[PDB]
């Protein structure tokens, strides 16, 4: 219970899917004392998106977790228009930035242990049956050099009870080089399309966020930069089908490698749950120390 009055603009974090997060300081005594916090926005606030926003905020507020982004309250002006999420603050920005940073100091044991974190932060997202359909590192937070937090859930949504699975397309972009491939053809979203995309994420962790590494351009090579729009994703489609991956990065051990390929299995019931994954991930980095 933020009201905007009191919430001080510092600076823009992050431009998302029809949503952006801005740095605050919440001065309520207006003697510079006050939290920086960070607080989520719509940048054009349409009925259906706000409707999806709610949603988020309940999604949110539903969760408690050391490795999930932790809700602070949510804010109004004159009415209820301009909704606004409050969160927690976190200071070294997004996995992806910060691993691109400090790409010098971060060895295999702490890529691992960040690893460990977002399987169980994803583990608990499934015993509350919430698909999250948007992991990657970008969406991936860094509270500490030894704590990251799964920080974003625009995309998330709640599986009906009767499904294990739940079908939804939207307009606009999607991150189709993260899909599982059942999401591709058909919209299917499941535990088991996040642990596909899991998949891409420990990739983007042991690629340490080389450009020209990256899931799209690597993909866009494997089918040729020629393709164009849709095409594209036609493309992707087949390419999946046939087995075609995304290639064991440098100097990634090979066991690995063989955790990210589980994950790319295009039988979606043989892909790993995200208990097995954090054993195996955990028992790696024991043998490691
Ligand atoms: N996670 C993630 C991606 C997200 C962008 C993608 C969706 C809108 C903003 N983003 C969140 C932040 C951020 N930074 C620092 N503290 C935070 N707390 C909550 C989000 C957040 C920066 N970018």
């Known amino acids: 219970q933020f009201e905007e009055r009191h919430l001080k603009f510092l600076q823009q974090l992050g431009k998302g899917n029809f949503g952006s997060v801005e740095m605050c300081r919440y001065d309520p005594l207006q003697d510079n004392t006050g939290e920086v916090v960070a607080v989520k926005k719509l940048q054009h606030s ?10 988020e905020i309940e999604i949110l507020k539903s969760l408690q977790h050391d490795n999930i982004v932790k809700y602070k309250g949510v804010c109004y002006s004159a009415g209820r228009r301009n909704l606004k999420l409050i969160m927690e603050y976190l200071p070294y920005g997004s996995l992806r930035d910060y691993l691109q940073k400090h790409k010098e100091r971060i060895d295999h044991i702490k890529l691992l242990q960040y690893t460990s974190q977002i399987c169980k932060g994803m583990e608990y997202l499934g ?27 625009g995309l998330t949504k709640v599986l009906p009870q009767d499904k294990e699975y739940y079908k939804v397309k939207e307009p606009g972009e999607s991150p189709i080089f993260w899909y599982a491939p059942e999401s591709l053809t058909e919209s299917k979203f499941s535990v088991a399309s996040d642990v596909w995309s899991f998949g891409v994420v420990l990739y983007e962790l042991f690629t340490y966020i080389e450009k020209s590494k990256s899931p799209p351009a690597e993909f866009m090579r494997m089918i040729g930069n020629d393709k164009q729009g849709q095409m594209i994703v036609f493309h992707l489609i087949e390419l999946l089908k046939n087995n075609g991956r995304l290639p064991r990065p440098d100097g990634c051990p090979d066991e690995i490698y063989m955790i990210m390929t589980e994950c790319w299995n295009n039988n979606v019931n043989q892909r790993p749950s995200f208990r097995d994954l954090a054993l195996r991930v955990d028992q790696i980095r024991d043998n490691m120390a």
């Open 46 to 55: 349409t009925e259906e998106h706000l409707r999806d926003f709610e949603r």
């Open 127 to 153: 015993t509350k049956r919430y698909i999250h359909r948007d992991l990657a590192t970008r969406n991936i937070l860094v509270e500490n050099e030894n704590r990251v937090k799964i920080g974003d859930f």
